[PDB]
Amino acid sequence: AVPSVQTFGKKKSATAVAHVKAGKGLIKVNGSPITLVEPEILRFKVYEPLLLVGLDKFSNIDIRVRVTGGGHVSQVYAIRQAIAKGLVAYHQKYVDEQSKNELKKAFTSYDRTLLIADSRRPEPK
Amino acid sequence: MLRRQARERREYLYRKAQELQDSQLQQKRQIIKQALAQGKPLPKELAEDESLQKDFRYDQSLKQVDDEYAATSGIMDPRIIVTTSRDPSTRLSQFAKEIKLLFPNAVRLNRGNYVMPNLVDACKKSGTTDLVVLHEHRGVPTSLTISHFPHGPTAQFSLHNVVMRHDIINAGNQSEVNPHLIFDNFTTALGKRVVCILKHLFNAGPKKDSERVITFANRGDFISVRQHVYVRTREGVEIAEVGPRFEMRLFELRLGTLENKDADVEWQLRRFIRTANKKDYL
Amino acid sequence: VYSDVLALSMRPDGKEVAVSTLKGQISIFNIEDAKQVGNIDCRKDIISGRFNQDRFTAKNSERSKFFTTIHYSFDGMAIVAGGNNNSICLYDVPNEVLLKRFIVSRNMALNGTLEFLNSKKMTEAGSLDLIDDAGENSDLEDRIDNSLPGSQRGGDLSTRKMRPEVRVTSVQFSPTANAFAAASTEGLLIYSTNDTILFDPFDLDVDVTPHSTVEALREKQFLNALVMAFRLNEEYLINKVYEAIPIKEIPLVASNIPAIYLPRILKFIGDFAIESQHIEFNLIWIKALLSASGGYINEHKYLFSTAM
Amino acid sequence: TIQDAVKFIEQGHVRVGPNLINDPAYLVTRNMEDYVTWVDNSKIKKTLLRYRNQIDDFDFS
Amino acid sequence: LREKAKERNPDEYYHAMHSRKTDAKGLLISSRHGDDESLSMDQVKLLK
RNA sequence: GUCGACGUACUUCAUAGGAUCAUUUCUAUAGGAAUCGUCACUCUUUGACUCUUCAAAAGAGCCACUGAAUCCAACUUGGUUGAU
RNA sequence: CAUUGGUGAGCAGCGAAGGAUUUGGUGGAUUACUAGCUAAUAGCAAUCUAUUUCAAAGAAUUCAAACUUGGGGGAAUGCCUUGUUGA
RNA sequence: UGACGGAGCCAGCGAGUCUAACCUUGGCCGAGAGGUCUUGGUAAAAACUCCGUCGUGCUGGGGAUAGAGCAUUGUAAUUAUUGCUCUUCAACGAGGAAUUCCUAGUAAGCGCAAGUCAUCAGCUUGCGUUGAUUACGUCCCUGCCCUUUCACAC
């Protein structure tokens, strides 16, 4: 049994599930590499959990993301949320708490919606 | 709050279940009260029911708004949200503004892309008492739904003969005062239920000099709604029509909110019964 | 927030709000824009004991791994925190780090004070501490068990079976002094700071000694003597120079005090003047300092709030 | 079963609000029913989430 | 069935949750042959 | 018109004869049937113990010394003149 | 194709006259160190008891004594209380 | 504020043994009823992304319907056989004055499904997908409403 972690990301009807296990660096979304995530114009939204912390944080793990629902924009936001939360959870479960806190600080400083779900519920006046 | 509302709904439905046996024991106790008052003999079953006679020494001290409206009748004023169907036309938006101005504590809310379960949850957490949804057929309002929160009745009305202030009135603004209500010709229990539902949309205790009068009059299961302004001349009261005029027809009454389709039906219109023409239910 | 919010505090500036949650975190948010400007992971710092009735380890217990009360320091730089645990924790909010931790109680008569329990007590019946031994008492009033089953706290007429638990219900900082109070089971724990104990120099130098300060005092360089006494930061030497300055020299010295040492002289005068008998001397010093640098205090409200 | 519930209470799995309750004799009010829940980091809670395939390790499950 | 699905408690726990499995779609997996499915190498060698 | 009178229609109210049990003897009857210091065997029911399934969950926690079991490695013996 | 399914057969790597799991028992610690026994200003510890008994001191509710009872109705005879009769 | 092809790629509602066009040319079988076959004419996720190609304008863009002229093709252009061009006839190129509605998953765009005892198909309702600008102040105006009848301090 390898060390593995399951996390979820949401944006509207989209839902992404990330499995982060011990590995070599394979980052796949829907059975396809992360560098083919469409659209081109929004690929860096998917990339930015990787680029905020560094690829060295991803050097020893495998991320596998399965996404259903929603549209292109919703699915991109669900992917990036699931990947960020899976990084934080893996570094808290099998790596140090200091690494977890530093990752959470970086992600929170850039964008909290990487970590906490953005729910646009109605507000009656 | 998700666990609180489900539990309170269960308790409410349990009370509705036990209400029948409670009523039956109430008539069994009412025979004893009349028998003790008049010196009348008891029937055989009440004579030989020893447990009821032993419990009457306790239950002798037991003695009206409906159950959904009992807790806050006259204590806290209502909050009403008036909304429309999914893609309202300009004329439906005008009528929604008119209905919002008709009610004294009501805000008109854009439907947009709002889902009904999300809207009901938003209304519950925001603390609104009532939700009114308006439907139309090419600019003509055809349906008006009133739902009481958190688990109150949902009544659906078919609107006929709709005339709007944007049409009749060339100018003038509505008074927006706490009005005086007139409920006419509501005799049956269904009529009392409709009177309770419609009455509790308005603020409690209008002051005596209020010039706005809102009238709901029952003619042949059709409720005429009028809004008038009166001036007390020494000769008499002269009346000015100041608001929209429409006829509304109750066709469905359910014991749940708008989101719930499994809610029990208190009353439904039956069009195809053989003797449907003869009866007047309201 | 990720978890159930149990405690809340406002910064005295009013720009930020700090929040203690169920997952052991204290998160700090800005109010003008709802942005989380900080987070402290406080869960591992908490000292949680094991009760005598617990069948689970204090490590695996989740009764008290959070804080139920938090409070900001009046300069807005620290937060004191307490809960249903045996620890009171002090944090520095810009660095998000723990300054000091205080053990609330050492009383074995309380319940959650020990993480580990002596295993001689455990028998095949259970703990020896849980055996109902009130029947051995001499008096009927001691022998009577007036308890109702499952009451969380008990009452005046109904005393609880289990022993009292260690807990802190409210922590606050003092507006006047460098002290804080905690409402705990034993009573009110007042923890204070006295500056007579530590040696904490500020901007020290090889030339700066108490002998050099007294020598400058004898040479009547009063501003230099006062600044050197502040650099040594010793209460007796500050008091010696402060009482040695003449009344005529007080406006010039108070005007020429550097802006860094002026919170120190205000704190010293505030602490000293309430017990001291030199009411007119202290009033003259306060008047001179308020005349010289009221505007600086007005700009730095929260830096000066405790002293003022 | 009620006996299973007793053991789960004494084993530290149950909280009523933020507060852990390891006393089985604790009496629950109608209002207090709505906060009788599993403690976080409970193997029981992880088991039920893992059964529904809805376990999120960021939330600690 | 709709009422039961609405009034389900998320915090329910059963010992059979250790045995039962749910697929990725969210539905219960029911074994066709199970009352296991896998054969050991010792069984496989004899059968072959 | 939850009004009376009359007319009409309906709803519900029976009861016996006999026997047994109930008094730490005797329930009133002589029409009935029971008073004894244990030896063994066989069968049956029940409950404890020890282990365990459904089927988990929690560990009065740490070190040290001293036994035992199991699986590999190595060695030994038997084995294509046949091991399993 | 996937298997965060089971059971196996093998490599690289790790690698000092082996390694890996499991388990019974005993010791120390789990609060902060002033030694054992007794009839205790001392004696004993191999006890004594063949001085261990005398004297002195010592008697209030003028027995006060269920602060100790699940609820509602009762009490033949008990029990309690009060009155009375005969000694 | 394009068009034209290719490629890539993403939803959430909906499951009653119930869901579903008309006329027409004929062949054959049959007592008929009809059956079967043949013929012909009419009713009935999008976005978005990527690649290629055309090309943008009062340099009006289209739609006719007739006629004329000149030629193609011609036995015969009378039948314009037809072709091209001109002429011929109507509207249009984002909608004036007035007026109305509207503050966040809102305005606006995009499709998809359902047809629920009233209402609706000259449509109604739902569902998801993209998703803003500006104000969030103030009683100046135009209305409406309301008042002028426990301590400390005022």
Swiss-Prot record, chain B:
Keywords: Nucleus, Ribonucleoprotein, Ribosome biogenesis, rRNA processing. Component of a heterotrimeric complex containing IMP3, IMP4 and MPP10. Interacts with MPP10. Component of the ribosomal small subunit (SSU) processome composed of at least 40 protein subunits and snoRNA U3. GO terms for cellular component: 90S preribosome; Mpp10 complex; nucleolus; nucleoplasm; small-subunit processome. Required for the early cleavages at sites A0, A1 and A2 during 18S ribosomal pre-RNA processing. Its main location: nucleus. It comes from the Eukaryota. This is U3 small nucleolar ribonucleoprotein protein IMP4. Coiled coil: none annotated. GO terms for biological process: maturation of SSU-rRNA; ribosomal small subunit biogenesis; rRNA processing. Residues 78-259 form the Brix domain. GO terms for molecular function: RNA folding chaperone; rRNA primary transcript binding; single-stranded telomeric DNA binding; snoRNA binding. InterPro entries: Brix, IMP4/RPF1. The keyword Nucleus applies. It comes from Saccharomyces cerevisiae (strain ATCC 204508 / S288c) (Baker's yeast). It is found in: Nucleus, Nucleolus. Pfam families: Brix. The gene is IMP4.
Swiss-Prot record, chain C:
Residues 140-161 are annotated as: Disordered. It is found in: Nucleus, Nucleolus. The modification Phosphoserine is found at residues 138, 151. Transmembrane segments: none annotated. It comes from the Eukaryota. WD repeats lie at residues 1-39, 62-101, 163-201. Required for bud-site selection and cell separation. Also involved in nucleolar processing of pre-18S ribosomal RNA. Present with 16700 molecules/cell in log phase SD medium. Belongs to the WD repeat PWP2 family. Interacts with snoRNA U3. Interacts with MPP10. Component of the ribosomal small subunit (SSU) processome composed of at least 40 protein subunits and snoRNA U3. This is Periodic tryptophan protein 2. It comes from Saccharomyces cerevisiae (strain ATCC 204508 / S288c) (Baker's yeast). The chain holds residues 514 to 821 of 923 of the full protein.
From Swiss-Prot, chain D:
The chain holds residues 123 to 183 of 183 of the full protein. Coiled coil: none annotated. Component of a heterotrimeric complex containing IMP3, IMP4 and MPP10. Interacts with MPP10. Component of the ribosomal small subunit (SSU) processome composed of at least 40 protein subunits and snoRNA U3. Residues 1-53 form the S4 RNA-binding domain. It is found in: Nucleus, Nucleolus. It comes from the Eukaryota. This is U3 small nucleolar ribonucleoprotein protein IMP3. Required for the early cleavages at sites A0, A1 and A2 during 18S ribosomal pre-RNA processing. It comes from Saccharomyces cerevisiae (strain ATCC 204508 / S288c). Belongs to the universal ribosomal protein uS4 family. The gene is IMP3.
Swiss-Prot record, chain E:
Belongs to the UTP11 family. Component of the ribosomal small subunit (SSU) processome composed of at least 40 protein subunits and snoRNA U3. Interacts with snoRNA U3. Interacts with EBP2, FAF1, MPP10, RPS16A and RRP14. This is U3 small nucleolar RNA-associated protein 11. Transmembrane segments: none annotated. Disulfide bonds: none annotated. It comes from Saccharomyces cerevisiae (strain ATCC 204508 / S288c) (Baker's yeast). It is found in: Nucleus, Nucleolus. Involved in nucleolar processing of pre-18S ribosomal RNA.
